[PDB]
């Protein structure tokens, strides 16, 4: 009953936006969890980027790759929306800087550069299986992975699976404390989600997030929020197959986020 208002708000949105919507909330402090369509599948879109960069750090720890090695940027590699990389054609960028780029701006070419360095979609998926995520899967690179068609299993996750995976990445021991802080900082320094959860975040709270937008109205966000008096809470919100405008989909996320935060601020 704690999340009753949240459920009601999610139900109103699924009606008004005639959409498929899923939410998962994990309270690390007391081991509590709640979801609505938490086992349903939704397109990952840019929320996968966190996984690719987490794998870069993991692979680096094992010595599979040097995060400081550079990769040559060529004009033919450029894909839609690559603000950081489009200014560095003819130059070399380190894998670490490519992760900073894609995590803070969602730069798509930067994401493909990371994918080519960590075994591509197949390597990413195998990594997910190893950490215990049995649902999430990456199958294509940018931009094709954003198709978001109903029933397509490619490049999807469930609100609960990705929430659990983010929990392990940042608070488990798969990554060193150093790499956990690095991954966290990349999410904390995200520059492109000001109109989502950050806009309704309680005074004094912190947030590490990664969002996504794709075909057929796909919109989502995976975040971790916390404060001096509030242990980490993982939030996963996904919308799919809706004709709603981007503003309406952002509105949905801020309304749901607001209700979720209220559970803890009240």
Curated annotation (Swiss-Prot):
GO terms for molecular function: beta-lactamase activity. The active site is at residue 46. Keywords: Antibiotic resistance, Disulfide bond, Hydrolase, Signal, Transposable element. It comes from the Bacteria. It catalyses: a beta-lactam + H2O = a substituted beta-amino acid. GO terms for biological process: beta-lactam antibiotic catabolic process; response to antibiotic. Gene3D superfamilies: DD-peptidase/beta-lactamase superfamily. Its EC number is 3.5.2.6. The keyword Ion transport does not apply. Disulfide bonds join 53-99. It is an enzyme of class 3 (hydrolase). PROSITE patterns: BETA_LACTAMASE_A. Substrate binds at residues 210-212. The keyword Metal-binding does not apply. InterPro entries: Beta-lactam/transpept-like, Beta-lactam_cat, Beta-lactam_class-A, Beta-lactam_class-A_AS. Belongs to the class-A beta-lactamase family. The class A beta-lactamase family has a specific amino-acid numbering system, sometimes called Ambler or ABL numbering and often misspelt as Amber. A multiple sequence alignment was used to derive a consensus sequence and then the consensus was numbered taking into account insertions and deletions. This allows use of identical numbers, e.g. for active site residues, despite differences in protein length. UniProt always uses natural numbering of residues, hence there appear to be differences in numbering between this entry and some papers. Hydrolyzes both carbenicillin and oxacillin. This is Beta-lactamase PSE-4. It comes from Pseudomonas aeruginosa. The lineage of its organism: Bacteria, Pseudomonadati, Pseudomonadota, Gammaproteobacteria, Pseudomonadales.
